[PDB]
Design a protein around this ligand. Sequence first.
Ligand SMILES: Nc1ncnc2c1ncn2[C@@H]1O[C@H](COP(=O)(O)OP(=O)(O)NP(=O)(O)O)[C@@H](O)[C@H]1O
Ligand SMILES: Nc1ncnc2c1ncn2[C@@H]1O[C@H](COP(=O)(O)OP(=O)(O)NP(=O)(O)O)[C@@H](O)[C@H]1O
Ligand SMILES: N[C@@H](CCO)C(=O)O
Ligand SMILES: N[C@@H](CCO)C(=O)O
Lengths: 296, 296
Amino acid sequence: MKVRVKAPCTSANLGVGFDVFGLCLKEPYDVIEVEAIDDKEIIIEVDDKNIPTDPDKNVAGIVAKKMIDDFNIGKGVKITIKKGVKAGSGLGSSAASSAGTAYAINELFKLNLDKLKLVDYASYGELASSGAKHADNVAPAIFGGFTMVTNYEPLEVLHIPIDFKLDILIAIPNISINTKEAREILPKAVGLKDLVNNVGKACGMVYALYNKDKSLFGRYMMSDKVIEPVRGKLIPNYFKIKEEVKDKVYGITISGSGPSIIAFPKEEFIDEVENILRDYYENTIRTEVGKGVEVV
Amino acid sequence: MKVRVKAPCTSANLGVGFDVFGLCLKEPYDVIEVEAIDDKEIIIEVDDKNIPTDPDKNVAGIVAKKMIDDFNIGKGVKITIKKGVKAGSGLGSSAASSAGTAYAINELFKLNLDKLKLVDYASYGELASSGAKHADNVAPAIFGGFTMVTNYEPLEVLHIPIDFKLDILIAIPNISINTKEAREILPKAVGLKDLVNNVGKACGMVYALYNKDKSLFGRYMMSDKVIEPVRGKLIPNYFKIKEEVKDKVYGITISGSGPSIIAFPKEEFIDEVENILRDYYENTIRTEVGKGVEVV
Ligand SMILES: Nc1ncnc2c1ncn2[C@@H]1O[C@H](COP(=O)(O)OP(=O)(O)NP(=O)(O)O)[C@@H](O)[C@H]1O
Ligand SMILES: Nc1ncnc2c1ncn2[C@@H]1O[C@H](COP(=O)(O)OP(=O)(O)NP(=O)(O)O)[C@@H](O)[C@H]1O
Ligand SMILES: N[C@@H](CCO)C(=O)O
Ligand SMILES: N[C@@H](CCO)C(=O)O
């Protein structure tokens, strides 16, 4: 009959973890309901008028069709989506719809697929919306916590639960940034030295999570000199904001391909950091690490 | 009066951890004795006739002088070295002398320096022998276990003890490879895709150690396509050996800049893997993860 889920926004890259790291947020999230229908068609309703309802264009339809065909399911589905945040915000909006749909289809048709497989299916949605089957936003959307996409073909995802408090502040600019473009402006090659820096800093972030060291995690997160300095120039006041909250956060960086900004405020300055972000971007939210798609 | 230590060989890079990762071996090692002397000169005796006795050229003399001057120590030292393995073997031979000396000087003159500082001093020895103040061999020589050099200026080293059994086989070709040259032949730039691969795989190796997963650790270790395929062409029969021990090891790769080869054999095939390595290289040894410089 029907399955309804909340599918969370996620923050990919986290600086030196470009195309690998992902952190699941508790909010915002999409509320997605999938209902099996007799007609073998996929019908989509979405509250954001800028998101297509064509099932071959909305990632929810792309993922549902792939799963329905792969399991010879003989039904269609009506998918209703209420968006947590607009597309192109750097908060994994489309990944929320892809992952929420994969999860919902799995439940609705009792496919008993494991999390890795759900991420793999959701990534077919990311293929379409970004032109690349990247799984770094759909992985945390499904697994919750912190994930690392460590291989493709075949997809491998390593998950590290965050079992300690990690306050998150997200500033969401009203402008949007197209991920494909955000990737084209990136260097085609990086110096051996950046390879070494990013590998060391990203490994240090993994060590930091196992040691529950927010300070180390946040500081290493801000050491990327390859991607973040580039995308950061697309975001109004981004560098000014970083300087203004400098000693009041464990770290702050671009969420995904931007323009949203993700900050991990120190407990002592959370209200103040939130007020600073809000002065620049009215749409600022306080959240924490989420647990992934779940029924609602 | 005198301090004598065993300073271990170490295996740097471990594939995707190039210039970051280091693993301390239990053997071979240098046996180094440092004796305070009244004359303010540094005298060096070494059993390998191809290693200089000039204190400005032997890394033990370079490190001792730096420490003696930095602490206004008013004595000279006589340093006697019995080498575990020749220089240019890819087993951190010079780092063993640098680290063993830093450690010995610290003990002899009761400097009470922490491990990080000892690595920093030892790295002055690596500056001279490789033209680069790399700390990826001296870090594990001092800390023991697995280390990651995650920053320079200032040096930062993260240590992960290996508290599970990890058998190591090392094949030591009679030829030598000069590290400076081994680095010049490396690509000056790598594609974004290799950046992503190596960051993900190296982070996966860190996750693997915390999860005591030798299989994952060894498999990711063999995924570098940037440095290992290049240096591997300098080592006779290296690729043939990799294929021949393919399913009998968790992983096998080049130790440091080569030509020595480091393999982590599966428990079931250890003798067989050792015999295979020995058929190609008579000088093959079986060892395990070491604990770093210690008094002997
Ligand atoms: N259900 C959906 N939800 C959001 N976006 C969708 C959806 N279906 C299709 N799209 C399209 O996919 C693109 C954006 O997906 P979105 O997740 O916002 O990615 P982004 O622009 O790459 N930024 P990031 O949040 O970093 O992944 C736009 O072309 C959307 O119209
Ligand atoms: N006490 C010493 N022990 C070993 N080598 C020394 C020593 N003092 C000076 N050297 C010189 O330093 C160079 C090699 O140092 P070594 O650690 O074997 O480095 P490598 O050639 O870079 N390979 P790797 O094992 O990967 O670090 C040669 O030029 C040596 O003569
Ligand atoms: N890793 C992708 C994530 C997009 O959310 C990028 O930054 O291009
Ligand atoms: N990371 C260095 C180590 C040398 O032991 C290299 O491979 O050039």
